[PDB]
Assembly symmetry: D2
């Protein structure tokens, strides 16, 4: 394990505290054994998400202070437009309040666009892996969300450079089975969140885009963690060994027609999202027509002016290789601590989180009893650290059959907010999980009490078995 | 006209400037003669809206700096929950990113809830006046938005205390015509924005709510300007002469079952919204399940923690009567200057804006050519002040006939952000509009070039009829 | 009277409240009938000073957030150095924590420098008018503070363009009487605070400086209100009718060798000061050696880095002519409201405050009895407004005689902070003072219960008669 | 070496960068081989001082935003007064712009007060150790600054619990030698900055006060690092094992009549100072009379209202034991990395810095050549770390025998990963220790040379 030094120093701090063991026992109980329902006061180190919990820079705060709050035509809207043209070469932007607002703007518009000439009667979206909000917006619009990530993502312990890659073979099979007229769009998720924050390679992105253009399919880059994906392409693809991060990013976006971004991830924000469209002005115009009732006027999209200002500055800071080397180096430090102590993880670690393979850590719990959640619950009761489950619990149920979607991966996700926690905080997280060495086989799964029909993991209430 | 002094002093400023006439003329053509498409840099004083442009206090900024950005369980969510219980006596909250996010959470839930028990077969919503994003969500979900504001709202020059009131006769007639089963909800808009920011009386709120419960109809308080409405109740209803503003608000919300709020108006914020539900936990649970895919997790709802913290403090500051007296007195001062000069306005002025009656100011322009928009564009080329149209352009086409919804009133809305402009800014606005007294005749209407199907006035480009 | 619109809009507000007459009377007695000893909570509109009470711009706050707090070599120290070269053409700067800190750094250095040559056996300083802390530092260093303002300043109701001017005949008289070897420095105070914020003409500054060089005498510009002085030069001097404000300022500082500045005035700050020296490197070095024990290291001078950053920005905003036009016009609006009702004021109004002539308003109270302080107290009891005395109270006793210095003016100063109050606040002040027309003849002065030996008006406790 | 986790998380960051080795030698050249003349843009990790470079909390920045900027009677002045009464039990406050502003207010007043009845004809001040600005103000007013730290502070490698103590024997001897009428005040400096940030025990503070009160001598507590001292007392005095940090502090200030404070240290500020007086109203009145010409009006003292607001909150946060344990543990972690690798340091480490003895690292450079400055320059050229010299360059040649480079650590600014960068730089200098040459004056000022002198390597 190698500690990589921060390429910054601290300017402002926020207190944290360890709640007592009896606080955590009561809190988890009151929260229905779902840490999503805990108050933050009951949490020590929060590893629930890397979304919106990032520490901004003094430059981002100063940009907020001078942000233009004008309802129409904010100065910051035009800076954000130029920045998106600078980084992605995309000519149209619509701000959104966060990533699932961008998906609510774009995905219904793509469906209606595809349904011209009476096509897309049995419509589907195709992705390496639809994350939860993305798949929910696909299915809420009456489509199937099809995930075709490479099967090397399924062998946790075996190294591979690109575990977020599309399976090109399955992509061709799905185009053959469904037909190009049913494929509303392809979604390239960079990095692949559900596979473990694992990068998609540039040739993979290129190859998927070639096939899509052959068949007239629209391609959307789910871009929440694009800077982490660009760093991995520079690190693992020899063809980009001497490229700047921005140069890799520019090339990534030659292989999509539009993007949906949660700016709460790699742009280092606490709120914000973005739709950018390359050159298709009709899809842009239709999305603007949906933005107005759902999000806001097309020059702020449900954001305050200051948050567009912070996003402009965040989009620059998130591409800095010195910062990305440290950020992804910190994730790698935590993974190497756990791996050295015999804890199975998705290897190599991805950009934003260590994914602990609980299918190997707790074999006595079947996947539909949520094994990673039993581990998460025990880790919290022992340490005050709050983690999150990326497995059968999050995967949910098939819209058609109403049964559990089969999960090939049962991950506990230790999600690391950017520039928030030190490597000493990582050591606490590592030692806490390692201290559970003798209790893993003792753990038992969980059973529902209240299950939402959609995105159930957020508010479900569980009971032990 | 009477000038009322600020109950505050200035702690931070932001420069503004006056574009040259050369820039304004050019900027308007580049904007398609739709001021909504002007860059803010081309605007001197911005009267487009009172939404999200407000100046916050130092205490509001301090609340932001210590805001808790946690994804789940932010301390500011629990503060917001207690604050809603304090102000409205409502036990459930869901934050939203702004008012139309709150509408998108709640209104589809209310429809499906009634549909699930075999009702709402031909569904309608009824309001004193649905505002545009509110009506847009009604229509997007397959329902009809019915507006029944008192006819006194159309008698602009004649003073009345409660020009936002429901027409009670018309409420009962619609309930009989459509049936209670088909009425998804009644929406009480306070103040009534479309009628000129005009207040709804307490006794009108109470009668509407009592009729609603007799028929099992859910009532939603559209609450963006609830503090301005409450100030008017204290000012004009003798029963509330000696009540506090909070006591007036507490009584107002006895006459609804839920609220949707744009916290960008009276809570004095730059972003933010809220759903609050009095005590219907099933509606609450259904609203939360829609919040998650559309807005965000149920304890931040598409807001930053710092914005929930700012809302908690702003909800307090927006009820302060010395602030409300000053704010509404500034709007009144602007209207008095215009009304002194013969310009017809909705009288008395409402809480957030002066509404100029352009059907009385420029009779030569027909309603479907948007006479208020012609006056707005001339005021911009003359002064750099950007105003907004509240008439046919905003009312739009009927989603069933595809033709112009008949506009009983053509208003140019001079909308005043809270604590942003001084009374000397008000004098500049009034002097410029009075300065167009000789050119109101020679003003002609406008036609469409690109018309959106929903909420057309925003991105539409207009062609001068000449 | 003419109301001039703010060339800004409001971005942040701070509550104020009117204390009840009962609280006012209790607080005034507890403060020893000296409003300097009132807590701010007992004050509605504060007109005690225009020092450190200004409202900053969003850009000033954005500069604070990114300020460099380094102990040595702050980025903002160098930016401030560059700003002084641009504005004043001066080559050396020493930041100070405020104006009297600048005077403490520089005045002892100028005296020892004059003595090292063998001179200064009976040392004096000469100014159009030394303000209080300036004269206190002159006297604390063993020198006499001689004031020779134009006689026009004593003719309060009669208009004159340049009531802050040096009396040229008296300058030569004092140079002949004391000898050039005894004059440590000439202090050009711009605007002349004690004469009523009244401007010094460019031709007067030039003639003073040329007389000073003739005799080898160092010239210091007391520059707390140099931008207001510059606006008056453009407005009233035909030579500069079409010059920019910055061009006026650059010409002003051709007529001095160094400057001491409270940045809490015209650079729109809440704290801060500055020494700038034109080119005399020896004085700069000696002043640096005194900066270290009294203020701090020479690259921050007792300021946080954020306050240097705000000063750079404020130096620029303080010179914008649209702002000065409004600021001075608001002072002029309040003065005109008072003058139209028959209240005698120093006319024309100066840059920062309206000076009410209380020798004429309350002729029954002798000067030694402080008639202006009687009007101030009455105004406060009536309205919550706190004003300050610029007469015999502030002038204090003479170090040699020990008795009251002869006061040629007895003013109540209504001091206006920058960008803080609106013209409706000005109307409130005007109506309050105008409403006291009947009570003016009935007022009675005060006596000393506790008199500090130096700068007695800040902390003295008085008792009516 | 044990790493102690931060009891906080990061809310706002500020970029740092490593300048190239060519920039370092060119900038150190322009700086005249004096690190104080480097711009910050030339410095990677700044270890020059723990004064004014601290990271504030979100609560401190919120307090600034609502700060009352009124000239007279700021809301935050009264808050600060109450906070001094709570923490110290002292009844009178005067804000100052920083520590040496507070000394400029109080020390000339104490001298005039002692002279009131034909006394103090040969006046002196006595301290466990006067810091530089403290000693400079004493001498600028015509007094001698006598330093009488315990002898165990001079044995750098040998542990002792209280290396900042007064030598009680010397205190009684100096009282007898100078007479209690010439002792204007005793200055108890906590922690003892010049001894290495080393604490003063409660019993030492107690006995010193008892002696002074018997002789009618005024006792001033120099309080810049009072919380760090309070932590060491609770950690090393068994009587206080179970006391809170605030209870320790309350007890400390029973043994003084006044305090001067740089709030730029333990109160976690970027600017700010404080005078507080226990109950002597006459000294308070005279101190206010000097505040007005020198600092500002007596309710802000040369501070913005926002900075007084931040001070009130910082005084609370600087007492938090979880934070102090981490803060003093991080300095100790750097010290242990160095001590475990054969680098001589003042042992144990103090509250705010690590002192490295360079006279033993470069046994080729004599005292008349500034060995610690050559190590500092060598450390800056290989890491970008700017440390300060406390040896033959702190000219106030006289004597020295102590050639220490100080590694001063700002509060809540640098991680233990930054500490490792620093330690590995100073340990990685083994290969170039022997080949390091001395430094000569290329340009020397007559006074305060280490602030502005220019040097050049000796060939
Ligand atoms: C009563 C009520 C409102 O007034 C209301 C918003 N009003 C606005 C803002 C904006 C919305 N459409 C417009 N058309 C023309 C000019 C401006 C606007 C206003 O400027 O009037 C909302 C929606 O909340 P939000 O804006 O999503 O947060 C719900 N209900
Ligand atoms: C011309 C000039 C000044 O006006 C000046 C400061 N003036 C002030 C502030 C204050 C000082 N004494 C007062 N007596 C009565 C009322 C207020 C005051 C003002 O309100 O007029 C200074 C000193 O600067 P600082 O305060 O250290 O930053 C130097 N020169
Ligand atoms: C690839 C990709 N696309 C779109 C989005 C949606 O963006 P948004 O609306 O939140 O801005 C995300 C968001 N991910 C975040 C937040 C989150 C959403 N659901 C979750 N379930 C469990 C744990 C966390 C989460 C994260 O994984 O922590 C994303 O990762
Ligand atoms: C015990 C004690 N008393 C008073 C003071 C004065 O407070 P101030 O005016 O700075 O606020 C201090 C301050 N010391 C600081 C800063 C500093 C001043 N001179 C220096 N020379 C070399 C290196 C650093 C410094 C420190 O040691 O780094 C103090 O330590
Ligand atoms: K957040
Ligand atoms: K806004």
């Amino acid at each position: 394990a190698k500690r990589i030094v921060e390429p910054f120093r601290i300017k402002m701090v926020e207190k944290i505290r360890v709640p007592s063991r009896e606080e955590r026992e009561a809190a988890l109980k009151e929260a229905g054994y779902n840490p999503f329902l805990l108050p933050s006061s009951a949490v020590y180190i929060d590893l629930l998400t890397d979304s919106g919990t990032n520490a901004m820079s003094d430059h981002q705060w100063a940009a907020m202070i001078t942000g233009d709050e004008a309802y129409a035509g904010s100065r910051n809207y035009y800076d954000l437009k130029d920045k998106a043209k600078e980084l992605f070469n995309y000519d149209y932007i619509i701000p959104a309040h966060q990533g699932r607002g961008a998906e609510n703007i774009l995905f219904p518009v793509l469906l209606k666009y595809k349904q011209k000439e009476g096509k897309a009667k049995n419509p589907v979206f195709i992705s390496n892996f639809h994350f939860d909000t993305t798949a929910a917006h696909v299915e809420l619009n009456g489509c199937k969300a099809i995930n075709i990530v490479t099967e090397k993502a399924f062998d946790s312990e075996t190294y591979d450079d690109w575990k977020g890659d599309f399976d090109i073979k399955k992509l061709k099979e799905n185009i053959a089975q469904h037909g190009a007229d049913n494929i509303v769009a392809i979604v390239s998720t960079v990095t692949c969140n559900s596979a473990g924050g694992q990068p998609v390679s540039m040739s993979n992105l290129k190859e998927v885009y070639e096939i899509a253009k052959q068949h007239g399919i629209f391609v959307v880059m789910d871009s929440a963690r694009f800077c982490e994906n660009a760093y991995f392409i520079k690190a693992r693809d020899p063809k980009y060994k001497n490229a700047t991060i921005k140069e890799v990013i520019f090339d990534m976006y030659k292989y999509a027609d539009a993007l949906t971004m949660s700016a709460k991830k790699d742009p280092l924000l606490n709120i914000g999202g973005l739709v950018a469209i390359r050159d298709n002005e009709e899809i842009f115009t239709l999305a603007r027509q949906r933005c107005v009732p759902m999000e806001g006027f097309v020059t702020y999209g449900g954001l305050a002016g200051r948050d567009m200002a912070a996003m402009v500055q965040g989009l620059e800071e998130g591409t800095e290789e010195e910062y990305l080397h440290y950020r992804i180096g910190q994730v790698k430090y935590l993974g190497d601590r756990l791996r050295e102590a015999g804890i199975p993880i998705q290897y190599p670690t991805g950009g934003h989180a260590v994914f602990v393979d609980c299918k190997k850590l707790v074999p006595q719990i079947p996947g539909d009893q949520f094994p990673a959640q039993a581990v998460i619950n025990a880790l919290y009761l022992e340490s005050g650290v709050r983690a999150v489950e990326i497995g059968s619990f999050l995967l949910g149920r098939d819209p058609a059959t109403g049964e559990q979607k089969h999960a090939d991966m049962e991950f506990m996700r230790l999600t690391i907010a950017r520039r928030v926690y030190t490597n000493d905080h990582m050591d606490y997280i590592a030692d806490a999980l390692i201290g559970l060495k003798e209790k893993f086989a003792t753990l038992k799964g969980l059973e529902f009490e209240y299950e939402p029909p959609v995105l159930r993991h957020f508010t479900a209430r569980l009971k032990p078995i």
